[PDB]
Design a protein around this ligand. Structure first.
Ligand SMILES: CCCCCCCC/C=C/CCCCCCCC(=O)O[C@@H](COC(=O)CCCCCCCCCCCCCCC)COP(=O)([O-])OCC[N+](C)(C)C
Ligand SMILES: CCCCCCCC/C=C/CCCCCCCC(=O)O[C@@H](COC(=O)CCCCCCCCCCCCCCC)COP(=O)([O-])OCC[N+](C)(C)C
Ligand SMILES: CCCCCCCC/C=C\CCCCCCCC(=O)O[C@@H](COC(=O)CCCCCCCCCCCCCCC)COP(=O)([O-])OCC[N+](C)(C)C
Ligand SMILES: CCCCCCCC/C=C\CCCCCCCC(=O)O[C@@H](COC(=O)CCCCCCCCCCCCCCC)COP(=O)([O-])OCC[N+](C)(C)C
Ligand SMILES: CCCCCCCC/C=C\CCCCCCCC(=O)O[C@@H](COC(=O)CCCCCCCCCCCCCCC)COP(=O)([O-])OCC[N+](C)(C)C
Ligand SMILES: CCCCCCCC/C=C\CCCCCCCC(=O)O[C@@H](COC(=O)CCCCCCCCCCCCCCC)COP(=O)([O-])OCC[N+](C)(C)C
Ligand SMILES: CCCCCCCC/C=C\CCCCCCCC(=O)O[C@@H](COC(=O)CCCCCCCCCCCCCCC)COP(=O)([O-])OCC[N+](C)(C)C
Ligand SMILES: CCCCCCCC/C=C\CCCCCCCC(=O)O[C@@H](COC(=O)CCCCCCCCCCCCCCC)COP(=O)([O-])OCC[N+](C)(C)C
Ligand SMILES: C[C@@H]1CC[C@@]2(OC1)O[C@H]1C[C@H]3[C@@H]4CC=C5C[C@@H](OCCC(CO)CO)CC[C@]5(C)[C@H]4CC[C@]3(C)[C@H]1[C@@H]2C
Ligand SMILES: COc1cccc(NC(=O)/C=C/c2ccc(Cl)cc2)c1
Lengths: 531, 76
C-alpha cells in the first residue's frame, strides 16, 4: 500500500527541507522506488502518482529549492535520467500530474523548464526529452497522448534565452527587422518521429483523451498541416474525391441498368452488358477496398465501443457500405434477387459518403461535422421520444379500429405522415368512437408535430450556438487525419517529398558541433515588442 | 535582395541613434533608396516595407526622436 516508502519521502511532502538534508547526509538513499499501491496511478483509487522517485516528488510538489538541492548535494545526487517501474522519468511523471488548470499549467511548465537546464548544466550531453518510458512514449508524446495542452504548448514554443541553454530551446528566431520577426519551430519528433509523432498521437488517439481538437490549434501544428495540405495533400484529396465520384457514377449506372428479367447471375449477351458488368466489377473492387481499408482502421485504431459514433462515424459508413457490397456479391452468385436490397443501401450510403470529402473544405466540412453531431445528439434523443409517441398513440388508435388500417404498420405509417405534413385526420371511419379517435390524434399531433418537431428546431439552435467552435476544431482534426493517412499511404517507401521544413542550422551542440534541425518557418509581426 | 541598403538603415532598425548621427555627419546620404526585394511589398514574402527611404523607416519604426533629428541635422 505504501510499499517502498522512506522517511525522505515524508519530508518532501511535509514541507521539510531541513530534514531532507538531514536524512540524505546520514545516508538516506535518493533513488528509492515508492512502488506501492497508493503511489501508482490513481485510476479512481485515492492516490497520488508523482514518479516513484524522490526527485520526482519534489518536482511535482513545487519546491524547486528542494529539487536543486537533491542534485548538487555532496553526499549523493539523484540520477537525473533515473526512471521508475513505469519507465517514467521526472519529466514523464511531471506530465502525468498535469491537469490543464492554469495554476497547474503555469507550474508544470515553470518546473519542467528548470529540470532541463539543470540536467543540461549537470549533463550538457545527456538528452532528457528523448527518453522513453516502458510503453515507448516520450514526455512530448505523453503530453499529446494524454491531453496536456499547456505542457505541449510549452514544449513546442520553448524559446530559452541563455548562453548554454538554447540547444534545448525549440522555437528559434532566425532574423528580425523592426516589427517583423521570423520565428522557427523545430519539427523533431512531431511529423516524422520514428515512434509516436505528435501528429500521430493527437490524431490516432481516443476521444477519451481530452483536448484532441484543441491540441492541433497549438502552433506550429496548425500552420504545419495547412502546409502539407497546400503542398501535396489537397491535390491527392481532390483526386481521391474524383475517383470516388467516378466510382459512384459507375456503381450508380450499373445499378440503374441492372437486369430485371431472370435470376442472377446474369448473362453477357449484348454489348451494353459487357460495358455494364465492367461497372459491376469496378463497383465491387471499391467495396473490397473500403472493406480492407476499414478492417485496417478498426485494427490499428482498436475502437472503443462508444467512440465508434463520435470519432469514426464516417469510417463506419464506408465500412458498412462495403458490407452491403459484399453481401451483394454473395447474393448475386447465390442466385437471390436480394442483392438489390443490399446494393441500394450501398448507393445511398455511397452518395452520402460524399460528405466525407467536405473535410477538404472548411465551411462545408464544419457543416458536415454539425450534421453528424445533430444526428447523434439531437435527432437520436428526438426519434426515441418520437417513436414512443408514435407507437403509444398508434396502438391506441389501432385498438380502437374495427373492421383497412386495422394494422399497427399502417396506423404507424399514417401517424408518421402527420409529422411530414401529410396527415389525414379522417384516414379511418372504421371505429365506434369518433371523439376518441380525434382527441387521440390531436393529442398525437399537438405533442409530436406542434411541440416536438418544433422543439427539435429549438434544440438544434441551442446546439448550433454551442458546437460552432467545437465543429471547426473537429474539422481541422478530420483534415489532419487525412493529411496523415495520406502521407503514409502515398509515399510509404521514400518519405522525402513531404518534408515540411528544411535543414536549418539553428545553433550548436553544447560540445560545439553544429545544430542542424528540420524546422518550420513562421513569419510574424509585433507592434509592442519594440526592442 | 538587400539592393540599395546602407549602414544608416541598419542603425535606425538596431535602435541606434548614436550611430545615425555618426553616419550622417561623415556624409552618409539620407536619400538612399532601399530598392531591394526584401524592402518591397511583402505579398506573402518575408519582408518589411517602410518607404524605401531612411526617414520613412524611422517613422514606421517608432523613434520620433530619430525622425526629427533627420530633418534639422545640420550636415544634411
Ligand atoms: C460517366 C463516367 C463514368 C465512367 C464512364 C462510363 C460511361 C458510360 C457508359 C458506358 C457504356 C455504355 C454502353 C454502350 C453500348 C450499349 C448501349 C445500350 O444498349 O445502352 C442501354 C443500356 O446500357 C447499359 O446498360 C450500359 C451500362 C452502363 C454502366 C455504366 C458504365 C460502367 C463503367 C464501365 C464502362 C466503360 C467505362 C470505363 C472508363 C471510365 C441504354 O438503356 P436502354 O437502351 O433503355 O436499356 C434498357 C434500360 N433499363 C435496363 C433501365 C430498363
Ligand atoms: C472533382 C469531382 C467532382 C466535381 C466537383 C463537385 C464538388 C466541388 C469540388 C470539389 C473538389 C475540387 C474543388 C477545388 C476548388 C475549390 C472549390 C470551391 O468552390 O470551394 C469553395 C466552396 O466549397 C466547395 O465547392 C466544396 C464543395 C464540395 C465538397 C465535397 C462534398 C461532396 C461532393 C459531392 C459532389 C457530387 C459528386 C458527383 C458528381 C461528380 C470554398 O470552399 P470552403 O468551404 O470555403 O473551403 C475552403 C476552400 N479551399 C479548401 C479551396 C481553400
Ligand atoms: C443546380 C444543380 C444542378 C442540377 C441539374 C443538373 C442537370 C441535370 C438535370 C437535367 C439535365 C439532364 C439532361 C438529360 C435528359 C434525360 C435524358 C433523355 O432525355 O434521353 C437520354 C437517355 O438515354 C441515355 O442517356 C442513354 C443511355 C445510356 C447512357 C447512360 C449514361 C448517361 C451519360 C453519363 C451519365 C453520367 C454523368 C455524366 C458524365 C460523368 C437519351 O435517350 P434518347 O436519345 O432519347 O434514346 C436513346 C435510347 N434509350 C433511351 C432507350 C437509351
Ligand atoms: C477499363 C477499365 C477501367 C475503367 C476506369 C477505372 C476507374 C474507375 C473509377 C472508380 C473506381 C476505381 C477503383 C475502385 C476504387 C474505389 C474508390 C476509392 O476507394 O477511392 C479512394 C480514392 O483513393 C484511391 O486510391 C482510389 C484508387 C486510385 C486509382 C484510380 C482508379 C483506377 C483503379 C482501378 C482499376 C481499373 C481497372 C479495372 C478494374 C476492374 C477513396 O479515398 P480514401 O482515401 O480511401 O477515403 C475514403 C474511404 N475512407 C475514408 C474510409 C478511408
Ligand atoms: C428501438 C426503440 C428505441 C427508439 C428508436 C431507436 C432508434 C435510435 C434512436 C434512439 C435510441 C436512444 C439513443 C439516444 C441516447 C441519447 C443520445 C446521446 O447520448 O448521444 C451522444 C452521442 O451519441 C452516441 O454516442 C451514439 C448515438 C447513437 C446510438 C444510439 C441510437 C441507436 C442504438 C440504440 C438502440 C436502438 C436502435 C434500434 C434498435 C436496436 C451524446 O449526445 P448528447 O449527450 O445529447 O450531446 C450533448 C453533449 N453534452 C452531454 C456534453 C451536453
Ligand atoms: C419505429 C416504429 C414503431 C415501433 C416499432 C417496433 C415495434 C414492433 C412491432 C410489433 C411487434 C414485433 C413483431 C413481432 C412479430 C409480429 C407481430 C406484430 O407485428 O404485431 C402483432 C400485434 O402486436 C401488437 O399489437 C403489439 C405488438 C407491439 C408491442 C411490443 C413492444 C414493441 C416495443 C418497441 C416499440 C417502440 C417503443 C417506443 C420507442 C422506444 C400482430 O399484428 P399484425 O401482424 O399487424 O396483425 C394483422 C392481422 N391481419 C393479418 C388480419 C391483418
Ligand atoms: C397533458 C395531459 C392531458 C391528459 C390526457 C388525458 C386524455 C383524456 C381526454 C379525453 C377523454 C374524455 C373525452 C372522451 C371520453 C371517451 C369517449 C366518449 O365518451 O365520447 C362521447 C362523445 O363525446 C363527445 O362527442 C364530446 C366530446 C367531449 C370531450 C372533448 C374535450 C376533451 C379534451 C380536452 C383537451 C384538453 C386536455 C387537457 C389539457 C388542457 C361518447 O361516445 P361517442 O360515440 O364518441 O359519442 C357520439 C359522438 N360522435 C358521433 C362524434 C361519435
Ligand atoms: C398537452 C397534451 C396534448 C393535448 C391533449 C388534448 C388534445 C385534445 C384536442 C382537442 C379536443 C377538442 C376537439 C374535439 C375533440 C373531439 C370530440 C368530439 O366528439 O367532437 C365532435 C365535435 O363536436 C362539436 O360540437 C364541434 C366542436 C369541436 C371543434 C373541433 C376541434 C378542432 C381541432 C383543434 C382543436 C384543438 C383543441 C385542443 C387544445 C388542447 C366530433 O364529432 P362530430 O360527429 O363531428 O360532432 C359534431 C358534428 N357536426 C357539427 C357536423 C354535427
Ligand atoms: C451488413 C449488411 C446487413 C444487412 C444485409 O446486408 C448486409 O444483410 C444481408 C443478409 C440478407 C439475407 C441473407 C439470406 C436470406 C435467405 C433467403 O432465403 C431464400 C433462400 C433460397 C435459396 O437458398 C431458398 O432456399 C431470403 C433472403 C435473405 C433473408 C436475405 C435478405 C437480405 C439480407 C438481410 C441482407 C441485408 C441487406
Ligand atoms: C462525414 O460523413 C457524413 C457526415 C454526416 C452524415 C453522414 N451520413 C449519414 O448520416 C448517412 C446515413 C444513412 C442512413 C441510412 C441509409 Cl439507408 C443511408 C445513409 C455522413
Amino acid at each position: 500500500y505504501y510499499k517502498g516508502q522512506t522517511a525522505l519521502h515524508i519530508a518532501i511532502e511535509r514541507r521539510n527541507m531541513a530534514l531532507v538534508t538531514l536524512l540524505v547526509e546520514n545516508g538516506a538513499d535518493v533513488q528509492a522506488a515508492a512502488h506501492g499501491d497508493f503511489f501508482k496511478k490513481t485510476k479512481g483509487r485515492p492516490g497520488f502518482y508523482f514518479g516513484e522517485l524522490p526527485l520526482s516528488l519534489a518536482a511535482c510538489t513545487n519546491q524547486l529549492g528542494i529539487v536543486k538541492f537533491l542534485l548538487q548535494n555532496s553526499w549523493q545526487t539523484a540520477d537525473i535520467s533515473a526512471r521508475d517501474s513505469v519507465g517514467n522519468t521526472v519529466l514523464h511523471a511531471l506530465v502525468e500530474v498535469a491537469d490543464n488548470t492554469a495554476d497547474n499549467t503555469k507550474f508544470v511548465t515553470s518546473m519542467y523548464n528548470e529540470i532541463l537546464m539543470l540536467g543540461a548544466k549537470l549533463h550538457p550531453t545527456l538528452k532528457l526529452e528523448e527518453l522513453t518510458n516502458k510503453k515507448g512514449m516520450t514526455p512530448l508524446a505523453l503530453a499529446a497522448g494524454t491531453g496536456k495542452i499547456g505542457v505541449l504548448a510549452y514544449i513546442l514554443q520553448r524559446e530559452i534565452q541563455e548562453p548554454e541553454c538554447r540547444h534545448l530551446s525549440r522555437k528559434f528566431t532566425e532574423w528580425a527587422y523592426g516589427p517583423v520577426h521570423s520565428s522557427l519551430y523545430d519539427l523533431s519528433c512531431i511529423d516524422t518521429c520514428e515512434k509516436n509523432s505528435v501528429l500521430e498521437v493527437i490524431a490516432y488517439s481516443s476521444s477519451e483523451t481530452p483536448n484532441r481538437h484543441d491540441m492541433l490549434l497549438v502552433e506550429p501544428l496548425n500552420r504545419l498541416l495547412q502546409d502539407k495540405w497546400d503542398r501535396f495533400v489537397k491535390r491527392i484529396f481532390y483526386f481521391n474525391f474524383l475517383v470516388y465520384c467516378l466510382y459512384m457514377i459507375i456503381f450508380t449506372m450499373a445499378a440503374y441498368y441492372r437486369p430485371v428479367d431472370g435470376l442472377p447471375p446474369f448473362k453477357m449477351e449484348k454489348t451494353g452488358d459487357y460495358f455494364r458488368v465492367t461497372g459491376e466489377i469496378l463497383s465491387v473492387l471499391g467495396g473490397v477496398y473500403f472493406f480492407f481499408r476499414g478492417i485496417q482502421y478498426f485494427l490499428q485504431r482498436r475502437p472503443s465501443m462508444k467512440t465508434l459514433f463520435v470519432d469514426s462515424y464516417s469510417e463506419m459508413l464506408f465500412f458498412l457500405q462495403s458490407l452491403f457490397m459484399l453481401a451483394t456479391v454473395v447474393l448475386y452468385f447465390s442466385h437471390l434477387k436480394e442483392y438489390v436490397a443490399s446494393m441500394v443501401f450501398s448507393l445511398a450510403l455511397g452518395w452520402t459518403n460524399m460528405l466525407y470529402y467536405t473535410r477538404g473544405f472548411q465551411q462545408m466540412g464544419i457543416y458536415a461535422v454539425m450534421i453528424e453531431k445533430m444526428i447523434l445528439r439531437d435527432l437520436c434523443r428526438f426519434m426515441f421520444v418520437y417513436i414512443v409517441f408514435l407507437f403509444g398513440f398508434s396502438t391506441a388508435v389501432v385498438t380502437l379500429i374495427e373492421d383497412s388500417y386495422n394494422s399497427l404498420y399502417s396506423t404507424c405509417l399514417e401517424l408518421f405522415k402527420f409529422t411530414i405534413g401529410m396527415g389525414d385526420l379522417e384516414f379511418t371511419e372504421n371505429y365506434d368512437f369518433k371523439a376518441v379517435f380525434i382527441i387521440l390524434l390531436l393529442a398525437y399531433v399537438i405533442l409530436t408535430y406542434i411541440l416536438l418537431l418544433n422543439m427539435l428546431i429549438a434544440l438544434m439552435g441551442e446546439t448550433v450556438n454551442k458546437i460552432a467552435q467545437e465543429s471547426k476544431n473537429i474539422w481541422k482534426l478530420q483534415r489532419a487525419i487525412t493529411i496523415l493517412d495520406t502521407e503514409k499511404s502515398f509515399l510509404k517507401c521514400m518519405r522525402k517529398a513531404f518534408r515540411s521544413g528544411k535543414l536549418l542550422q539553428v545553433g550548436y551542440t553544447p560540445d560545439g558541433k553544429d545544430d542542424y534541425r528540420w524546422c518550420f518557418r513562421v513569419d510574424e509581426v509585433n507592434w509592442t515588442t519594440w526592442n
